[PDB]
Design a protein around this ligand. Structure first.
Ligand SMILES: *[C@@H]1O[C@H](CO)[C@@H](O[C@@H]2O[C@H](CO)[C@@H](O)[C@H](O)[C@H]2NC(C)=O)[C@H](O)[C@H]1NC(C)=O
Ligand SMILES: *[C@@H]1O[C@H](CO)[C@@H](O[C@@H]2O[C@H](CO)[C@@H](O)[C@H](O)[C@H]2NC(C)=O)[C@H](O)[C@H]1NC(C)=O
Ligand SMILES: *[C@@H]1O[C@H](CO)[C@@H](O[C@@H]2O[C@H](CO)[C@@H](O)[C@H](O)[C@H]2NC(C)=O)[C@H](O)[C@H]1NC(C)=O
Ligand SMILES: *[C@@H]1O[C@H](CO)[C@@H](O[C@@H]2O[C@H](CO)[C@@H](O)[C@H](O)[C@H]2NC(C)=O)[C@H](O)[C@H]1NC(C)=O
Ligand SMILES: *[C@@H]1O[C@H](CO)[C@@H](O)[C@H](O)[C@H]1NC(C)=O
Ligand SMILES: *[C@@H]1O[C@H](CO)[C@@H](O)[C@H](O)[C@H]1NC(C)=O
Ligand SMILES: *[C@@H]1O[C@H](CO)[C@@H](O)[C@H](O)[C@H]1NC(C)=O
Ligand SMILES: *[C@@H]1O[C@H](CO)[C@@H](O)[C@H](O)[C@H]1NC(C)=O
Ligand SMILES: *[C@@H]1O[C@H](CO)[C@@H](O)[C@H](O)[C@H]1NC(C)=O
Ligand SMILES: *[C@@H]1O[C@H](CO)[C@@H](O)[C@H](O)[C@H]1NC(C)=O
Lengths: 663, 40
């Protein structure tokens, strides 16, 4: 019937007309979320003596007799969604007061009649989302004394009146939804009648001028803390709007997607207590210095796409925001950084510049001077079409932790004059760059680096110098991939003992392990004792030295994949003990031996020897089948992937189907 | 350890590649991140 895990009979989608009538009587959450019922009589419900959370949403119910609440005193939450309870009665639930929540979304109620509910001793939440109510006259006398979160989410309301809220004379409202409902009037006095109206929501409602000013004057001398004015058409700002909000102790605001085209003058100076600020997605075209007056208590700023595709951010237009901590100037057409742009933001901790500049092709020394007095922790700086980094463009940044310089066009030949300072650098994101030629002293000025990401960067001059990574001693992740590197000496990793991940993925090292190379194969995987993941993939090594993996003892994953490698030498994994995985996908391995691959399969957990064309004979795969008989190693699927290919005698067979006793 | 920031790094590089158009590495990074999450 219905799956029951512990105490929930989750009848998810079982189109039914009657209750199941066969579940244990101690179930509570009879989650019949679509089961097309039409009546809930007080006879079948008798067995359900421990029902707690009756959820029958998305159903077609038109009547609820009071007898239903006779047999359910333990009910806590009811959720009647998308029903047809247009008609309501005084006794549909009158004595039925033990709820802890209530929801009646999309019941299509056009009238509240007289007083559908008058006790409501424990009603925390009440939702009327998509009904069509045109008032707030939910009663006639004092009631709802314990309601917290009322939701008039989307209705046909037109105004607000003092008399209609008299029922809320002593109700502590926390977060009041009046969103998505065109209001065109506010009669004098609405919210001082309500005892503890804290929140307020006016999103997706067109207020505009001649209404916003009257609203903010109406809110006067009220205990409102949050606010919401998203998508409300507000093309400008003046010192007369939000004037009445000088007496409110308001701690939040929301003015996003409203297309604030221009900011006139000293505005917001009437909001000295604003702690959050949402002006994202605006069509702003200018920014005067006196635009942001008095916002000295704002802690979060959201300007992701306010500055539209040229704006002229005036001089010293940020000096007033003395308490800003999070900046969101991400996706704008800001034309370059002026010398007096970001002055005074000494509380800044997050910059988020990415796709903002159409002028930052280069970074000169006198370009980041504005942030000299401002501490900085995260410097995003991605894909602003940066061309080249000149000398000492990061001198003014001393507390910086992340230099996330990826998706850029940085093509040059470094010398070490671009990271002057940056003694507290913890991460550089140099991936996805055009080219970067090295020297022996390019990273000598950053001994504190911990994460050198060098993927998809055509990295030359890697072997000619003594060691480009010799100064690096606190490096843990060395991402070196998609660079077409094809010549390496014992210089990658000299003194780098705390390196943990050494990806070398799309590299042409195939020719430098061969046995015909003068001086022997290059044994560059040396000196490593704390390497966790070493992805030597997609290179083309058709050979492995017997002692190529001597230094690696605690290594976990030793992935060698997508190569032309076969004929594994014996004892190749002899010394690796804590080798929690292998991977030799898409190779030419055909024969497995108890010495070649025995000691490696001890404490294993995964294998992906997927597409190698196994030779299928009683000696080629015998230990392998006797080992896959009992799989303490959670190997992935063995169906239609491991196949017998070489010998025509028994060709075309999965490995497990081999007969062990025949040989 | 950097294992947690490594499972964050693979994801972020996956969105970077997806915005740049490298689906095969996106799939490999997702599978590798899931496997490392299993092993952690
Ligand atoms: C909010 O309360 C203040 C008082 O704290 C009101 O200020 C009074 O305003 C009237 C005229 O508007 C003056 O005659 C009083 O002297 C003021 N009282 C003061 C300054 O303490 C303010 O008007 C109220 N806001 C309203 C009614 O919207
Ligand atoms: C709001 O800004 C307006 C400007 O548009 C101010 O109006 C000026 O006020 C000064 C000082 O009283 C007077 O010269 C004129 O009344 C206005 N001058 C100009 C050039 O417009 C207004 O005073 C500001 N404050 C309020 C409360 O409206
Ligand atoms: C930023 O770099 C420019 C270019 O080097 C510096 O301008 C030079 O300053 C020195 C010192 O006064 C002068 O002798 C040169 O004539 C200037 N021009 C050139 C082309 O060198 C500028 O001083 C640097 N600013 C800072 C703060 O270091
Ligand atoms: C620098 O900014 C970029 C762009 O916002 C950040 O990349 C985002 O990372 C989150 C976290 O995984 C993803 O959900 C977004 O999709 C990424 N954005 C894009 C455009 O792909 C990046 O994380 C920031 N740098 C740091 C160090 O956090
Ligand atoms: C509820 O009834 C089921 C049905 O047998 C039983 O397995 C479970 O232990 C019962 N739980 C309680 C708390 O009585
Ligand atoms: C009840 O079922 C709905 C529909 O899937 C689900 O969203 C909700 O989380 C369920 N409630 C439970 C299981 O308590
Ligand atoms: C139900 O409400 C009554 C009346 O307030 C109260 O006495 C009783 O303790 C409540 N029981 C539960 C389980 O809520
Ligand atoms: C105002 O909104 C913020 C963010 O959602 C929330 O943390 C805060 O609790 C809200 N204020 C009140 C009084 O609930
Ligand atoms: C904030 O201002 C209102 C307006 O008078 C006042 O009622 C409220 O008590 C103030 N908040 C605090 C914490 O004093
Ligand atoms: C606001 O008005 C003052 C009046 O002293 C003026 O100095 C300032 O430039 C104005 N700001 C504007 C027009 O952005």
């Amino acid at each position: 019937k219905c799956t029951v895990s512990h105490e929930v009979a989750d009848c998810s989608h079982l189109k039914l007309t009657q209750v199941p009538d066969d579940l244990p009587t101690n179930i509570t959450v009879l989650n019949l979320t679509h089961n097309q019922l039409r009546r809930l009589p007080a006879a079948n419900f008798t067995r359900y003596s421990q029902l707690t959370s009756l959820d029958v949403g998305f159903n077609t119910i038109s009547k609820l007799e009071p007898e239903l609440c006779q047999k359910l005193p333990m009910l806590k939450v009811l959720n009647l969604q998308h029903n047809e309870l247009s008609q309501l009665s005084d006794k549909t639930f009158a004595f039925c007061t033990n709820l802890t929540e209530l929801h009646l979304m999309s019941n299509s109620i056009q009238k509240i009649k007289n007083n559908p509910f008058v006790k409501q001793k424990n009603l925390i939440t009440l939702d009327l989302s998509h009904n069509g109510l045109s008032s707030t006259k939910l009663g006639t006398q004092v009631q709802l004394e314990n309601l917290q979160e009322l939701l008039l989410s989307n209705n046909k309301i037109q105004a607000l009146k003092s008399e209609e809220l008299d029922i809320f004379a002593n109700s502590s409202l926390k977060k009041l939804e009046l969103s998505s409902n065109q209001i065109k009037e506010f009669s004098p006095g609405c919210f001082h009648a309500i005892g503890r109206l804290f929140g307020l929501f006016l999103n997706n409602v067109q207020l505009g001028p001649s209404l916003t000013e009257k609203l903010c004057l109406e809110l006067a001398n009220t205990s409102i803390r949050n606010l919401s004015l998203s998508n409300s058409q507000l093309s400008t700002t003046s010192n007369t709007t939000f004037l009445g909000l000088k007496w409110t102790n308001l701690t939040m605001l929301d003015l996003s997607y409203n297309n604030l085209n221009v900011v006139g003058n000293d505005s917001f100076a009437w909001l000295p207590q604003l702690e959050y600020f949402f002006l994202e997605y605006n069509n702003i075209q200018h920014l005067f210095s006196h635009s942001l007056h008095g916002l000295f208590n704002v802690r979060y700023l959201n300007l992701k796409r306010s500055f539209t595709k040229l704006p002229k951010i005036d001089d010293f237009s940020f000096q007033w925001l003395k308490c800003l901590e999070h900046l969101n100037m991400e996706d704008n057409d800001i034309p370059g950084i002026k010398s007096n742009m970001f002055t005074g933001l000494i509380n800044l901790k997050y910059l988020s510049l990415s796709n903002s500049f159409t002028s930052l092709r280069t970074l000169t020394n006198e370009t980041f001077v504005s942030l000299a007095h401002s501490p900085l922790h995260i410097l995003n700086l991605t894909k602003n079409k940066i061309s080249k980094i000149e000398s000492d463009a990061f001198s003014w940044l001393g507390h910086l932790e992340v230099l996330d310089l990826g998706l850029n066009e940085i093509g040059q030949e470094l010398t070490g004059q671009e990271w002057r300072g940056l003694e507290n650098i913890f991460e550089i994101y140099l991936s996805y760059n055009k080219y970067l030629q090295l020297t022996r002293n390019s990273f000598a000025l950053v001994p504190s680096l911990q994460r050198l990401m060098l993927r998809r960067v055509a990295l030359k001059n890697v072997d000619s110098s003594p060691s480009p990574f010799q100064p690096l001693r606190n490096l843990t992740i060395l991402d070196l991939s998609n660079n077409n590197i094809a010549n390496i000496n014992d210089d990658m990793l000299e003194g780098l003992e705390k390196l943990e991940i050494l990806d070398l993925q799309h590299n042409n090292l195939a020719r430098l392990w061969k046995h015909a190379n003068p001086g022997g194969p290059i044994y560059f995987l040396k000196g490593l004792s704390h390497l966790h993941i070493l992805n030597l993939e997609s290179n083309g090594f058709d050979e492995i030295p017997v002692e190529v993996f001597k230094d690696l003892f605690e290594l976990k994953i030793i992935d060698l994949g997508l190569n032309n490698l076969n004929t594994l030498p014996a004892s190749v994994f002899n010394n690796q003990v804590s080798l929690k995985s292998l991977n030799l996908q898409k190779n030419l391995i055909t024969s497995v031996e108890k010495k070649v691959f025995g000691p490696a399969f001890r404490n294993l957990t995964e294998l992906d020897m997927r597409f190698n064309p196994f030779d299928c004979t009683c000696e080629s795969i015998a230990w392998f089948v006797n080992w896959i008989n009992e799989t303490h190693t959670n190997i992935p699927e063995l169906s239609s992937h491991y196949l017998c290919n070489t010998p025509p005698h028994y060709h075309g067979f999965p490995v497990r189907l081999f007969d062990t006793s025949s040989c | 350890s950097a294992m947690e920031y490594y499972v964050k790094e693979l994801l972020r590089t996956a969105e970077y590649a997806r915005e740049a158009g490298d689906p095969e590495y996106v799939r490999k990074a997702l599978e590798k991140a899931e496997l490392v999450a299993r092993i952690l």
